[PDB]
Design a binder for this molecule. Structure first.
Ligand SMILES: [Ca+2]
Length: 886
């Protein structure tokens, strides 16, 4: 005591009809606030700062509720003070929570579970405490620096105007790169020189200096870093990949080059990144991870990179001009795990609101990146504007003309401004486009001529408008703000249609990314229309894991496309996540530096020697097996690596884990297992190579995914034939298999759920508990249910981003399979028929758990012996010995 009965108000960001926020604080148990969307929290202002001692919560019924309570004494930071996570039903007595005399002027109550409904509620909330006599300070307004006002602008302009400074900056940066990649001790073993292009092409040179140093030339930063990489790979037997395992062990003396090499690339651009990568992979990256990635990029020839960092600040400044407060902008924009589909105009709000801190920190990160990109000569692809507005845009701008875009996977798509209007109508596409392109300049300055925008990505509605005219107007508007602009357009499943593309009146100033060239190429239509285009390897969908690559097609189809075209201006990668199969990515970027087809088999032979730091007859034999099975050329249509049954929602007749995925293994399983047998045999000798360990884990987890599929088919039979004892046995072996798999995945830092989650919670500095918890929600949601019920179930996104990860496997995948198996066992044993399992309910239970109150997942890999784990896999859980195993 005492109860705070006066001066208290409340807000929410959604409610069902008649069940408003104020009903949570009206003294009446019969009236309640109820959620209508994914904002399941209310915010109570107490009319002053109180030292709280008790908080009391009533719900509308006797369901089981779970919620977290946060408080703020400064109006900015909301920190967790209480929570209910027990399985006790609500009742007429309410729930009483003791607070450790915490100072608070505001409270947030986030109800994350209701056993009875998707919708949550608070019938009453009573707060008890002692009045401090103080009031909350004013909340600082979001303010960011203008680019021209920062040291970043001075540096950017200096590099631009002063050739000697620019060259000195580039050359120092490439030396810094060497020291980051292989160690500071190797920096002074290199001499870097800028030279000209070779007949209009990017080019590098590597040769001996005459005093035991390596002299490397390049026309620019990425040419210089590519020469460095070339030297490492071809002379040092070193392989750098910061995301998927390296061999960075340098020779004792620096190897001599011998005959000087001069290597050019016929491609103007080497492209990297899908909008999706910024979500499935990069959601929670700090500068350290970005710097690392850019070093890998420059070393791999990359000079064109999609860039959406800090674009929330750009949109904020733009919408602020058209009737939106900062809070309204924050409700529009998604959370940090969803920017891919926000910027692709597919969804809004979900995972947010972002903290106020977000905007400055991210504008600064993007500025940091444009400085490094400028040094290397990497062109960022910034944002174009196509007409994306919130659904309430007309409400705030009555003369605006908009086209309703409908739903995408159960999310409301933003509206789209009519790209043109009738005479006598206000043209808000022109108004908003002008502001956007101006504000983007204000935030980042003039850093690129490349702008990406993709109207009608995976649906939408063109309304009454002409398709070609829409694309003419978007491009003309883009060129109005940058005369040299190039509109970078994604080509996905025949869209944009030929009619849309024929609307581009300046073909030179558009560039189409053929997104899926290694499985389903579609560049002929672009070539025929004289559109500049880029051949792209997609490879990875949703970050879904498994042994999968197309090295033969990369080694042959790329130079074949160069010979058979006149408008192929580059190659690149467009993966939805960068987390899988390093072979595919090294080969792809290697193919930029040849005009001739190469032998993928002998390419692989050399690749594995530098990756492992050594090779032998048996290891080569194992990789040829991988090339003959998992990496064998195929001519069908498929999206990503074949999915593991372990990761699928349990049921009968499963043929995938995700809606658009596949579980069909097109190679011989027993043959593939021979590769694991060879790796186990050579473990003790190759165990000093981390990349070897990485690859061993990759193929071994693939072995167990494959055999789980077969064991699942057997236990399905044992159930259908009514054999309860046989089902018990095979289902037991199935579960023991998953447990072995969890041990295998525990060995790699990159397979830990705990790193993904901790990165989310630590990505910004000085985050309150509210922000950490929300960002953990984003991390957990994306790799499981994706969205909430209507997104996961009706919308088809359930387990789209499924990961063969440690922690996630034990607590989520195993748990699903265990529950289904038990219900089937109970029925077989003469019990009641197996119940329907509301899978989403169980999954979203895991999604909403917090690292600080529930279970903290480790950030440290285990010491398990892959060689031994492989022997146990071969003996007890294989396809080869399946008949003996039973
Ligand atoms: Ca009430």
């Amino acid at each position: 005591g005492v109860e705070i009965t006066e001066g208290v108000t409340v807000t929410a960001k959604g409610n069902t009809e008649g069940n408003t926020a104020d009903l949570a604080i009206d003294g009446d148990l019969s009236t309640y606030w109820e959620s209508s969307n994914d904002y399941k929290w209310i915010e109570v202002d107490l009319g002053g700062i109180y030292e709280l001692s008790k908080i009391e919560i009533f719900n509308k019924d006797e369901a089981v509720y779970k919620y977290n309570i946060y408080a703020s004494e400064d109006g900015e930071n909301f920190n967790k003070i209480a929570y209910k996570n027990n399985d006790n039903v609500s009742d007429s007595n309410g729930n009483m929570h003791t607070i450790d005399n915490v100072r608070a002027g505001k409270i947030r109550i986030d109800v994350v579970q209701n056993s009875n409904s998707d919708r949550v509620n608070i019938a009453e909330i009573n707060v008890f405490g002692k009045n401090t006599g103080e009031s909350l300070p004013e909340v600082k307004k979001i303010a960011t620096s203008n680019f021209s006002e920062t040291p970043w602008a001075t540096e950017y302009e200096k590099f631009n105007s002063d050739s000697a400074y620019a060259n000195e900056k580039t050359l120092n940066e490439i030396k810094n790169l060497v020291g980051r990649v292989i160690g500071r001790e190797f920096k002074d073993k290199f001499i870097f020189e800028i030279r000209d292009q070779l007949n209009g092409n990017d080019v590098f040179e590597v040769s001996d200096s005459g005093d035991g140093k390596v002299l490397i030339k390049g026309n620019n930063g990425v040419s210089l870093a590519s020469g460095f990489n070339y030297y490492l790979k071809n002379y040092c037997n070193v392989s750098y990949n910061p995301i998927m395992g390296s061999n960075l062990k340098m020779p004792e003396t620096m190897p001599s080059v011998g005959e000087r090499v001069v290597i050019d690339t016929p491609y103007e651009h080497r492209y990297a990144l899908n909008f999706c990568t910024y979500s499935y992979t990069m959601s929670f990256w700090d500068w350290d991870q970005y710097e690392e990635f850019l070093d890998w990029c420059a070393m791999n020839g990359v000079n064109l990179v999609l860039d959406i960092i800090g674009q929330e600040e750009v949109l904020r400044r733009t919408l602020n001009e058209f009737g939106y407060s900062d809070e309204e902008v924050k409700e529009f924009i998604s959370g940090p795990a969803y920017f891919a589909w926000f910027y692709m105009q597919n969804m809004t709000g979900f995972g947010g609101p972002l903290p106020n801190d977000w905007f400055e920190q991210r504008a600064e990160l993007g500025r940091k990146m444009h400085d490094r990109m400028q040094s290397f000569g990497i062109n960022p692809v910034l944002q174009g504007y196509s007409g994306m507005v919130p659904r309430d845009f007309k409400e705030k701008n009555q003369e605006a003309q908009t086209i309703s875009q409908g739903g995408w996977c159960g999310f409301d798509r933003p509206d789209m401004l009519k790209t043109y209007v009738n005479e006598g109508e206000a043209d808000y596409f022109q108004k908003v486009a002008d502001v956007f392109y101006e504000k983007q300049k204000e935030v980042f300055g003039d850093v690129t001529n490349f702008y990406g925008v993709d109207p009608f990505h995976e649906g939408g509605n063109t309304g009454d408008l002409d398709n070609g005219k829409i694309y003419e107007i978007i491009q003309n508007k883009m060129i109005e703000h940058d005369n040299d602009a190039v509109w970078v357009i994604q080509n996905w499943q025949g869209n944009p249609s030929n009619n849309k593309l024929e609307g581009l009146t300046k073909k030179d100033q558009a560039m189409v990314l053929d997104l899926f060239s290694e499985v389903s190429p579609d560049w002929n239509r672009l070539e025929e229309r004289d559109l500049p285009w880029i051949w792209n390897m997609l490879h990875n969908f949703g970050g879904r894991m498994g042994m999968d690559a197309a090295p033969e097609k990369l080694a042959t189809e790329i130079p074949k496309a160069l010979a058979n075209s006149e408008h192929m201006v580059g190659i690149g990668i467009t993966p939805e996540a960068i987390n899988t199969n390093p072979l595919a990515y090294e080969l792809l970027f290697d193919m930029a530096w040849t005009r001739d087809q190469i032998n993928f088999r002998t390419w692989t032979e050399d690749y594995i020697e530098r990756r492992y730091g050594k090779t032998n007859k048996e290891i080569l034999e194992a990789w040829n097996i991988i090339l003959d099975t998992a990496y064998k050329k195929r001519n069908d249509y498929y999206q990503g690596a074949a999915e593991s049954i372990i990761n699928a929602r349990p049921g009968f007749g499963i043929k995938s884990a995700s809606t658009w995925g596949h579980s069909k293994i097109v190679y011989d399983k027993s043959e593939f297992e021979k590769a694991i047998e060879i790796f186990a045999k050579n473990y003790d000798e190759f165990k000093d190579s981390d990349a070897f360990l990485y690859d061993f884990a990759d193929i071994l987890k693939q072995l167990l995914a494959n055999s789980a599929q077969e064991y699942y088919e057997v236990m399905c039979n044992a159930y259908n034939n009514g054999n309860g004892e046989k089902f018990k046995f095979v289902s037991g072996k199935f579960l023991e298999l998953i447990k072995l798999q969890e041990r295998v995945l525990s060995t790699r830092p990159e397979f830990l759920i705990g790193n993904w989650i901790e990165d989310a919670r630590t990505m910004l500095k000085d985050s309150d508990d509210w922000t950490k918890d929300l960002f953990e929600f984003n991390a957990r949601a994306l790799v499981t249910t994706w969205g909430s019920r209507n997104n996961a179930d009706g919308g088809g996104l359930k387990d789209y981003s499924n990961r063969q990860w440690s922690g996630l496997t034990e607590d989520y995948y195993y748990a699903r399979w265990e529950k289904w198996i038990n219900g089937l066992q109970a029925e077989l044993d003469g019990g009641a028929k197996a119940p329907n399992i509301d899978w989403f309910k169980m999954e979203y239970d895991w999604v909403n758990k917090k690292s600080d109150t529930d279970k903290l997942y480790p950030t440290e890999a285990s010491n398990e012996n892959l060689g031994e784990l492989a022997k146990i896999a071969m003996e007890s859980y294989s396809v080869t010995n399946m008949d003996k195993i039973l």
